[PDB]
Amino acid sequence: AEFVPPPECPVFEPSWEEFTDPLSFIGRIRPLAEKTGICKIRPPKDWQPPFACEVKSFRFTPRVQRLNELEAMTRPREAFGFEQAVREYTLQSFGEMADNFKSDYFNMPVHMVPTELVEKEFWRLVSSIEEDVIVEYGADISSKDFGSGFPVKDGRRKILPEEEEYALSGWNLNNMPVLEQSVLAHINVMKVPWLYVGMCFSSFCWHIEDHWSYSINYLHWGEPKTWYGVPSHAAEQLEEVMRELAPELFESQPDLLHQLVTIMNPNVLMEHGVPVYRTNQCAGEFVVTFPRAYHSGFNQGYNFAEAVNFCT
Ligand SMILES: O=C(O)CCNc1cc(N2CCc3ccccc3CC2)nc(-c2ccccn2)n1
Ligand SMILES: [Mn+2]
């Protein structure tokens, strides 16, 4: 049985007038987008920010992902835990590895592999015990390490005159409001975007953000990032289904720890009555996750994303 793609989440193509500030736009589209958990926003055609990361020094140690680790629990192999150690890549060397992996895996040029094929094969590999596929995920790279993907007027990197509008734009993830209101905030006497370098099959589990926060994600360049989302009204329904289908050894684990391994086929959630929506986030497009909207996904290939939590 092949994977059945969930219905598509809403995609918005705002005009220049509607693109004037994100918080007003997200607040207007919320009656529809909050019913799907996630939504995609395509900026106007002429809105093309530069890539402002320090590429000459960009290096990272991506985490190793055993895609079928949950299904493998039904088997202890000899010397388990020593499968593959983490290594350091550059932005170039990671891309060379990523493109070579995908082209070798599908026996096709990387740009010719349909998004539906990677999606179908990803969910087959997750539940396969006959094949052990291992990928790497350059996740949790702080924008403070090598700079944000967006230009920032902090004096650390040169900004051309035609790039200044992107350093001051409200859609620049460094210009999103992040300070939550509370009484403690008036008693005590800092959040920044995070970067994610992906390859084919690199994935993130079903989870919600801390404090049920909104999140916005921008794909600077590369192959698409495939998303799955669940609206907040079905959050407790997903949690009960996920706990019933997770291994019994993890069923009583707290949410913050359970979310570290929650890779689950969306078709199984949909069969249990959970509404799920999907999207392919392409280069230059935004994805907004709404409060308490569970979401997961994987990368179609070598790409570079930036994400931050924002408050309303
Ligand atoms: O890849 C992207 O574009 C962002 C995907 N979303 C992620 C991705 C992500 N990472 C993906 C790598 C990974 C893989 C497996 C388990 C945990 C993690 C955490 C880092 N972590 C988080 C996270 C962390 C803390 C609180 C809330 N969210 N969110
Ligand atoms: Mn997250």
| Domain assignments of the chain as residue spans, ordered by start | 1-312
Report whether 210 contacts 307 (CB < 8 A): no
307 lines ligand 1 (CB under 6 A): yes
204 lines ligand 1 (CB under 6 A): yes
Contacts of 46 (CB under 8 A, 6+ apart): none
Short-list 41, 87, 43, CA closest to 62: 87
260 lines ligand 1 (CB under 6 A): yes
Count of residues making up the chain: 312
**Would you state the structure tokens that stand for residue 239, as one six-digit string?**
């949690």
DSSP the chain: ----PPPBPPEE---TTGGG-HHHHHHHHHHHHTTTSEEEE---TT------S-GGG-EE-PEEEETTHHHHTT---TTTT-S-----EEHHHHHHHHHHHHHHHHTS-GGGS-HHHHHHHHHHHHT-SS---EEEEEEEEEHHHH--SS---SSSS---GGGHHHHS-TTSGGGS------SGGGT------EEEEE-TT-EEEEE--GGG-EEEEEEEEES-EEEEE--GGGHHHHHHHHHHHS-GGGTTS-HHHHTTS----HHHHHHTT---EEEEE-TT-EEEE-TT--EEEEESSSEEEEEEEE--
Closest-lying ligand 1 atom to the alpha carbon of residue 261: 16
Short-list 243, 260, 208, CA closest to 69: 260
Report whether 308 contacts 150 (CB < 8 A): no
Bridge-partner residues for 194, per DSSP? 142, 307
Short-list 98, 88, 107, CA closest to 223: 98
**Would you state the structure tokens that stand for residue 87, as one six-digit string?**
């290594």
Task: Give the resolution to one decimal, in Å.
Answer: 1.4
At 203, phi and psi to the nearest 5? -140, 160
Measured CA to CA, the distance from residue 82 to residue 285 in angstroms comes to 38
Question: If you measure from the C-alpha of residue 64 to the centroid of ligand 2, how many angstroms do you get, rounded to a whole number?
Answer: 18
User: Computed from CA positions of residues 183, 189, 193, 195, in that sequence, does the dihedral angle turn out positive or negative?
Assistant: negative
- What CATH number does the domain located at 1-312 have? 2.60.120.650
**Would you state the structure tokens that stand for residue 152, as one six-digit string?**
């920032």
Ligand 1 pocket test, candidate residues 70, 195, 204, most atoms within 8 A of CB: 204
305 lines ligand 1 (CB under 6 A): yes
Q: How many CA atoms within 13 Å lie on the side-chain side of 128? A: 14
Contacts of 270 (CB under 8 A, 6+ apart): 6, 276
Question: Which amino acid type is present at position 8?
Answer: E
